[PDB]
Amino acid sequence: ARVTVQDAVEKIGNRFDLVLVAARRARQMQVGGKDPLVPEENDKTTVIALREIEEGLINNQILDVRERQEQQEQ
Amino acid sequence: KTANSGYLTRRLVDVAQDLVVTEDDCGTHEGIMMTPVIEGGDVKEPLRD
Amino acid sequence: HRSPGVFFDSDKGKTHSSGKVLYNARIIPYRGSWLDFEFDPKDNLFVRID
Amino acid sequence: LLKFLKAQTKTEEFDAIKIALASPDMIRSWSFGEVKKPETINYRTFKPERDGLFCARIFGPVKDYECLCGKYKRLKHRGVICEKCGVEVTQTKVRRERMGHIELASPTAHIWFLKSLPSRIGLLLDMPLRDIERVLYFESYVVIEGGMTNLERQQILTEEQYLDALEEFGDEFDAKMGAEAIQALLKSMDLEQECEQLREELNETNSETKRKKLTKRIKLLEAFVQSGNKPEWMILTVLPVLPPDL
Amino acid sequence: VKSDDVNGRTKMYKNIVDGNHQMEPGMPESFNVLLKEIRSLGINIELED
Amino acid sequence: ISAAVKEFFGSSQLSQFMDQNNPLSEITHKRRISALGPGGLTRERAGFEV
Amino acid sequence: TAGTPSGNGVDYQDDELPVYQGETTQSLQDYLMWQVELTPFTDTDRAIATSIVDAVDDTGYLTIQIEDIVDSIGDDEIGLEEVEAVLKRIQRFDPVGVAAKDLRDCLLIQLSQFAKETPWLEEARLIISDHLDLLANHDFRTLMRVTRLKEEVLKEAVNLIQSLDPRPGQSIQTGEPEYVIPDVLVRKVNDRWVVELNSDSLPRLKINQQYAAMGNSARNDADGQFIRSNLQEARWLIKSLESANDTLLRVSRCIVEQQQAFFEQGEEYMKPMVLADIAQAVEMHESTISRVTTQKYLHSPRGIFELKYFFSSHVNTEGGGEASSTAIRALVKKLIAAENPAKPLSDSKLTSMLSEQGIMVARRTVAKYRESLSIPPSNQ
DNA sequence: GCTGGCACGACTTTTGCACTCTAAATAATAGATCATGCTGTTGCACA
RNA sequence: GCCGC
DNA sequence: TGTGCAACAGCATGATCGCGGCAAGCTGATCGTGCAAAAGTCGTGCCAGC
Numbered sequence A: 001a002r003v004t005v006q007d008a009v010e011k012i013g014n015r016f017d018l019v020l021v022a023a024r025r026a027r028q029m030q031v032g033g034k035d036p037l038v039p040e041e042n043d044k045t046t047v048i049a050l051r052e053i054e055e056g057l058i059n060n061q062i063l064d065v066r067e068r069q070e071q072q073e074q
Numbered sequence B: 001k002t003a004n005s006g007y008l009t010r011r012l013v014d015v016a017q018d019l020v021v022t023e024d025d026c027g028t029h030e031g032i033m034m035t036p037v038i039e040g041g042d043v044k045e046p047l048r049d
Numbered sequence C: 001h002r003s004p005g006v007f008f009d010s011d012k013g014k015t016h017s018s019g020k021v022l023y024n025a026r027i028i029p030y031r032g033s034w035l036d037f038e039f040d041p042k043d044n045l046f047v048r049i050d
Numbered sequence D: 001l002l003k004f005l006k007a008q009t010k011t012e013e014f015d016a017i018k019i020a021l022a023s024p025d026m027i028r029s030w031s032f033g034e035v036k037k038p039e040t041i042n043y044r045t046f047k048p049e050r051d052g053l054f055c056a057r058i059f060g061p062v063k064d065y066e067c068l069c070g071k072y073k074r075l076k077h078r079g080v081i082c083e084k085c086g087v088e089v090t091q092t093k094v095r096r097e098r099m100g101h102i103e104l105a106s107p108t109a110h111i112w113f114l115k116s117l118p119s120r121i122g123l124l125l126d127m128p129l130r131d132i133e134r135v136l137y138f139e140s141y142v143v144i145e146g147g148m149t150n151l152e153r154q155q156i157l158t159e160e161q162y163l164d165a166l167e168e169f170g171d172e173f174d175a176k177m178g179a180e181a182i183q184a185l186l187k188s189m190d191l192e193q194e195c196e197q198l199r200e201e202l203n204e205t206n207s208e209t210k211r212k213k214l215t216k217r218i219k220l221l222e223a224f225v226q227s228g229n230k231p232e233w234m235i236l237t238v239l240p241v242l243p244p245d246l
Numbered sequence E: 001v002k003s004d005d006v007n008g009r010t011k012m013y014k015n016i017v018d019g020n021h022q023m024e025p026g027m028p029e030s031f032n033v034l035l036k037e038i039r040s041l042g043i044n045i046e047l048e049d
Numbered sequence F: 001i002s003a004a005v006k007e008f009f010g011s012s013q014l015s016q017f018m019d020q021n022n023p024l025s026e027i028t029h030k031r032r033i034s035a036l037g038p039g040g041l042t043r044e045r046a047g048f049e050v
Numbered sequence G: 001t002a003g004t005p006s007g008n009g010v011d012y013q014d015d016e017l018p019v020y021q022g023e024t025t026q027s028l029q030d031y032l033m034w035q036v037e038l039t040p041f042t043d044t045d046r047a048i049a050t051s052i053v054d055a056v057d058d059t060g061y062l063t064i065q066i067e068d069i070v071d072s073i074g075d076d077e078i079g080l081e082e083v084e085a086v087l088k089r090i091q092r093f094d095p096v097g098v099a100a101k102d103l104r105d106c107l108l109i110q111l112s113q114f115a116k117e118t119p120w121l122e123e124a125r126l127i128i129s130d131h132l133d134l135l136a137n138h139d140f141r142t143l144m145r146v147t148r149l150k151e152e153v154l155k156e157a158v159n160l161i162q163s164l165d166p167r168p169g170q171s172i173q174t175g176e177p178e179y180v181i182p183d184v185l186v187r188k189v190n191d192r193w194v195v196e197l198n199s200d201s202l203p204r205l206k207i208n209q210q211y212a213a214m215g216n217s218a219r220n221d222a223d224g225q226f227i228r229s230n231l232q233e234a235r236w237l238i239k240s241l242e243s244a245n246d247t248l249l250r251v252s253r254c255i256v257e258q259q260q261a262f263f264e265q266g267e268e269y270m271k272p273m274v275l276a277d278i279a280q281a282v283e284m285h286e287s288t289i290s291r292v293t294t295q296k297y298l299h300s301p302r303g304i305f306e307l308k309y310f311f312s313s314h315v316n317t318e319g320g321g322e323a324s325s326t327a328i329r330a331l332v333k334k335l336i337a338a339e340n341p342a343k344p345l346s347d348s349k350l351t352s353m354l355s356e357q358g359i360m361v362a363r364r365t366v367a368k369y370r371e372s373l374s375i376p377p378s379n380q
Numbered sequence H: 001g002c003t004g005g006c007a008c009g010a011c012t013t014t015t016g017c018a019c020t021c022t023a024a025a026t027a028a029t030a031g032a033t034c035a036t037g038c039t040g041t042t043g044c045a046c047a
Numbered sequence I: 001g002c003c004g005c
Numbered sequence J: 001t002g003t004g005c006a007a008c009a010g011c012a013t014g015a016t017c018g019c020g021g022c023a024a025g026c027t028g029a030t031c032g033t034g035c036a037a038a039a040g041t042c043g044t045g046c047c048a049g050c
């Protein structure tokens, strides 16, 4: 549970782009074909994506590359 | 007075709604001079504010 | 409500922005048409019926 | 002929809403029929009256994929026009979309363009809005053409003057007291020669009084020329009607 | 959707029941009513592509 | 006659349900003076001095 | 009025330019399509579901045939094998038993969803529903021998059968419009049975039309005089309404004076009133009077509410002069109702009794009268 | 032999086509506030 | 008509 | 020195005047017509089932 997303905002600093990046990651974890990269503490995919962004292992560029790698795999 | 204030707010919103920050830096050298608000011998607004 | 009768007013003296106070007279009946007497800035009697 | 998806395709890509005047042909293009009876429905059978304001032959059906008189009532029938009644089998929501049109048997003027302080018809005519209002309601005549006689192109001769001209001029005098007169003299105008002549005058003579009126006239004339409209479309000889469900 | 999108409402409800949470927005019916009302005057208003 | 009488008594501006929350509320409604109504003045037509 | 009912709840759209707007309502098909959207179906399955939901009647039954459903699709690999599967899936919806082919299907589907330990489930699952349904319609005395079971157990097997819902799908149906009647023509009982016309509102429309049209014309703010714009339109409106009211009142008066025998004493004293009979009475064409009397209703202390009922052109070749079948129909109903427990009421016997009473009616004519609203009490 | 739902020749009902024909009486008063265009009035320069 | 401004 | 033109004051008209919520409170339709044309129906007699 994350009351404040400051850390996530400062990881990639716009306060607007992060909301999108987190929506993309949350769609990935919710619709299917993705598993969290951080331990799951019975919390929702929204805050899971926010915590992954805060930990520094999720950003728009990696979503673009991981997508490219998984498209080349198929 | 509540109406008179709401009509003013409507007019201001409708005149100003089309303003978004769409650039990072324009590079212009134009500006405005800023001085403290001194009225006669009494000051209300320092330069810092 | 306003009682029927005759009443005199001055519209506060700010109509023409010239500082001219305009005086008017009015007759109200219980039922029927109304009667008005007014003063123009040129000081001429005017009657506004109904 | 099944699995059709019309609700999905109802959302179509778009951009840059435009607005313009509607020609009579454009109005007829929208229309799915003509309204001729001021009766929406009949209490005899509690059905939408034929050729009325609320009708089923136009505007579409009234109950799902069934049609009036029950000749074709199922979804198996699609786009079928019954012989007894022109009602077509449909979802019936089309009652919010189909428009319909009514003829005026006589041209009338749009209050949108007539009755406004910067009246586009009156300013285009240049003649006063009071004159147009008097002509529009048959109080006075406005002669047109009449080059041979002494009458001007935009004369405001009244009934007595009309009788005098008929006694004296006889032929060559063309005056109408209706909205057809304004449409006729709106059609006869040539925008290019008129606007150019006004521009030639505007630049030849300079005065702070006439400059504003001349500039406004050049602006409006160019608007019409640069827009593709036709000044005769202000007056309308037809009339669209709203879909019944609205 | 959730106001005047007739198809968007049902699509959103189905997605929420399925646990998808995707808006898939369309066009409000009020704007269509406005277009019909304006066309019912002598004015032609259209959506370009 | 009956139509006019019932029109006045039933559907009129000064005719309305008496507040029955309390006896005092009913008394206040009974002793109440209004400047509006048919022969009165409308709300927007009123001014500060009225 | 000794007592007055409270005003019915009404509404009108406030603070909205298109006044009164409207309100959506839920129907049987609307509630069934809502369930279709929320169940896992494929594209073709959804298309079939919509096709068979469109064919569901207000009762919730499937009016169109399954083969006709397959024909409507007109798509390969959409044979009745999968149409049946989608149909069963839809039948297992919230109004259980909806969209059923016939009465047997409703009961079979309803009985499928039970505890499977019901005391007489299997006794009535197929033995009574899927077989010998006509016997259950009848006394089913021989059904006990047919099913090799005692009458005692059947006495509650049929109880469970009746516990099953007869017509499922009309429960979700709302029913807000009561179709009440204002009874435009109230008539009362006096020394000669006078009649009156209510709800005219002609003076009300006259006063409003005056205050609007003639009010604007009399308002001297506008130049000239509006003596022809609306002043001679309100007059036309008043004349039209008054003419319609007078025509209706005169026609109803003629009907009442002719059918006073119906209202007086017993009801079934109708003369076979033909359109020409009143047409000559008012010296006016029958068609204009007919159109008038199509949906106009009268308020009676005992009489039926409907002008068209009095016409009964049914001379029936009755013995002395002529008579009316509606009166004859009431006589037949009363006679058949008051009979022995056997109640033969044979169409030949009933016709003979009617002829003895003085109504020379054919044997088959009485049969059509009986079959109109009744069934032969074991007359076969 | 007894009984119970199908057709037929008069009668009856419905339906477009079709052109119809006064004085009363109701409210103003009691929002200002601003912008714009039309019309009559007056100062200024010319032959 | 009332409630929160 | 009498005259025509452009700038200006007075008047009439149009447009605008906050946001949410709860009550109680309610509108009609008309011809008509006669006339055949058409559709529809009623009293009556059929053949098939018990």
Ligand SMILES: [Zn+2]
Pocket: D067, D068, D069, D070, D071, D072, D082, D083, D084, D085, D086, D087
């Ligand atoms: Zn049809």
